[PDB]
């Protein structure tokens, strides 16, 4: 426990010293990015020692080291939960973050604010680890909002761009709408259980958890960009490619899923919440994969893939498979972050060109980028025995051998087929065919920083799924008896997706001219959800600011009060100055004094 507890904290403390040196300014900006990259690589190693201890003897502990604040009977402490989920996610996050920073040392080389960029990348990782290791909801909330603000500052990296400011604020808007559920959960848990600490929430095991769990589901919808609060994630492609790589793999977008995994002791006894999350995930995975079929911007295609994958994780939550959903978080982290780095390699070589229509012929011109992009696409589609197979293949078998919504299941299988279609789309248009880029050829991918960073993620995309699946302890009864046609479903539909996508892709070479179907436009324009909502909702709200209120106003207006005093003043003072009239009024005052008020009686 001494080595386990001590080393699991230095990992977190090590990530902060680069922050302290910049803020304390006792560092050396000669090569700050290398310093930040070195810190991750060491923090990854120190985080492996606790992980091996967990793998060996199942060791888990909680560290409550600092008493921050007591609120009558609610005591809050800095409390770190080093358990199954924390010990497995931290090394995966640090390993992928190690590659992204090495890639960032090349991609952002000419950025004058490179030092600030790496400072923000590190803070972005620090908050994700606060979120992952938090043992109570208040400390978890610190991480919840920490990643939100760091997304804002990194999506809007190029702050001269108006669209980058629109996209950065849109991430805040959607994620903050999700936080209404998060605050709802904390309110319910404090009121009904007297705690924000997870140990007490699970021990009391509330039976009536519909309200707190809907709060967490609504929180997860925004953070993980599920249908309804989804548009911001594609818009987050405004930020530099390293931001997209780190945003979409081992930080912000899986916090929503990770939050629902933390609370599986509650959701596993609540069938109502399981149905809601299954259907929410099922629509998300279909809708965003359908959008990816007709996107031409390479980052947006990969971005919509992440939304599709996050829906699949939410489906896994729905079918009551919290640990499969977690394993998919870890495996998806490798090849998704690699695809975004492979795309960055192409964008950099084609002079900031992102549209796939102006690529092509890169298969031989960029050999190493091409290899990683095929491995990544095969891993994503669930090729047998690559990193993505060890989670996606299991999830599909669990879904279709479960008591579940039939529509949710079907939509998850169709979306799986769509995954092959838009993976073929990137490969076919980026790499195959004849070149379609401008004439001045500047294709170069021989930087060791680019090669090493992708090389390490390539190795993870191959074996990481195998390595993790064979080392984690079993916590369920995996359903391994089913008809052949249920066992092989994921493989078959994925294969049909490749065939069907290949035929359509080859269909574009013909000398035919076609009008867009309503279906094509609907997918291309993202279902019109951003087009409608992002004009209507802002317009209703920005333009948002009877006779009864007329009385309550005209009567109480300062103008009304101040203008009646002006009438009374004029009546009092507009006199003729005549002795005759003043004394005539003295007569009237005396008469009414006696006759009417009896002041003499």
């Amino acid at each position: 426990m001494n080595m386990f507890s001590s080393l699991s904290l230095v990992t977190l403390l090590l990530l902060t010293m680069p922050i302290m040196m910049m803020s304390f300014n006792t560092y050396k900006p000669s090569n700050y990015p290398l310093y930040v990259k070195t810190a991750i690589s060491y923090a990854f190693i120190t985080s492996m020692i606790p992980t091996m201890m967990f793998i060996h003897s199942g060791q888990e502990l909680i560290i409550s080291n600092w008493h921050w604040l007591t609120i009558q009977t609610l005591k809050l402490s800095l409390s770190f939960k080093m358990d199954y989920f924390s010990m497995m996610f931290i090394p995966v996050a640090l390993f992928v973050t190690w590659s992204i920073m090495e890639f960032s040392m090349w991609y952002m080389y000419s950025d004058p604010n490179i030092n600030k960029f790496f400072k923000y990348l590190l803070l972005f990782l620090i908050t994700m680890l606060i979120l992952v290791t938090a043992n109570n909801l208040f400390q978890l909330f610190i991480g919840w909002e920490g990643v939100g603000i760091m997304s804002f500052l990194l999506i809007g990296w190029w702050y001269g761009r108006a669209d980058a400011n629109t996209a950065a604020l849109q991430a805040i808007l959607y994620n903050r709408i999700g936080d209404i559920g998060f605050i709802l959960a904390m309110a319910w848990f404090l009121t009904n259980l007297n705690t924000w600490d997870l140990q007490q929430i699970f021990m009391l095991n509330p039976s009536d958890s519909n309200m707190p769990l809907i709060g967490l589901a609504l929180a997860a919808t925004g953070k993980s960009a599920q249908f309804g609060l989804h548009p911001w994630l594609p818009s987050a492609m405004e930020g530099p490619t390293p931001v997209s790589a780190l945003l979409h793999s081992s930080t912000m977008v899986v916090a929503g899923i990770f939050l629902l995994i933390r609370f599986y002791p509650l959701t596993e006894n609540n069938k109502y919440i399981q149905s809601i999350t299954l259907c929410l995930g099922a629509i998300t995975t279909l809708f965003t994969a359908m959008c990816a079929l007709t996107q031409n911007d390479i980052k947006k295609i990969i971005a919509f893939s992440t939304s599709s994958q996050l829906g699949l994780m939410m489906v896994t939550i729905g079918i009551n498979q919290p640990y499969l959903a977690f394993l998919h978080i870890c495996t998806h982290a490798f090849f998704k972050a690699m695809l975004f780095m492979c795309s960055g390699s192409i964008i950099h070589s084609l002079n900031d060109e992102q549209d796939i229509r102006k690529m092509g012929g890169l298969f031989k011109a960029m050999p190493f980028t091409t290899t990683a992009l095929i491995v990544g696409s095969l891993a994503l589609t669930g090729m047998p025995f690559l990193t993505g197979f060890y989670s996606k293949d299991l999830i599909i078998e669990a879904a279709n051998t479960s008591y579940t919504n039939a529509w949710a299941l079907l939509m998850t299988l169709i979306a799986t087929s769509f995954t092959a279609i838009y993976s073929t789309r990137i490969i076919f248009f980026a790499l195959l065919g004849q070149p379609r880029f401008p004439t001045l050829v500047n294709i170069n991918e021989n930087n060791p920083l680019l090669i090493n960073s992708i090389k390490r993620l390539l190795i993870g995309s191959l074996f990481a799924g195998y390595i993790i699946s064979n080392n984690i302890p079993p916590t369920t009864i995996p359903q391994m008896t089913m008809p052949y046609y249920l066992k092989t479903t994921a493989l078959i539909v994925t294969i049909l997706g490749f065939i069907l996508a290949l035929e359509i892709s080859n269909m574009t070479k013909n000398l035919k001219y076609h009008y867009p179907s309503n279906a094509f436009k609907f997918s291309t324009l993202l279902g019109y959800f951003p087009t409608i909502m992002h004009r209507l909702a802002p317009y209703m709200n920005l333009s948002m600011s009877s006779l009864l209120d007329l009385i309550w106003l005209e009567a109480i207006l300062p103008k009304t009060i101040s203008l009646a005093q002006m009438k009374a003043s004029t009546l009092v003072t507009n006199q003729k100055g005549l002795i005759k009239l003043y004394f005539l009024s003295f007569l009237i005052t005396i008469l009414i004094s006696m006759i009417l008020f009896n002041f003499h009686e």
Partner: protein, 86 residues
């Protein structure tokens, strides 16, 4: 991306024009008016601008494009936008 030069821009501007079948690569010179000397019409001038746009990877607005009537004017326009002073 590697930097441009005035002679490099002029070399590529003519290079594109030399691969256009409506222009005689012998009569071509940096000062040939596309209308008076080369005999082209308004519609061909539009396609020339699109070819230069595809060559250098940036758009020339229609308000500016219609005034570029000789190869030298195109060369001058590109250098101004790319801050080429050689």
């Amino acid at each position: 991306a590697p930097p441009l030069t005035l002679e490099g821009i002029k070399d590529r501007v003519l290079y594109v024009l030399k691969l256009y079948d409506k222009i005689d690569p012998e009569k071509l010179s940096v000062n040939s008016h596309f209308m008076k000397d080369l005999g082209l019409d308004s519609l061909d001038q539009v396609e020339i601008i699109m070819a230069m746009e595809d060559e250098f990877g940036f758009e020339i607005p229609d308000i500016d494009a219609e005034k570029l009537m000789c190869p030298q004017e195109i060369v001058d326009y590109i250098a101004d936008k790319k801050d080429v002073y050689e």
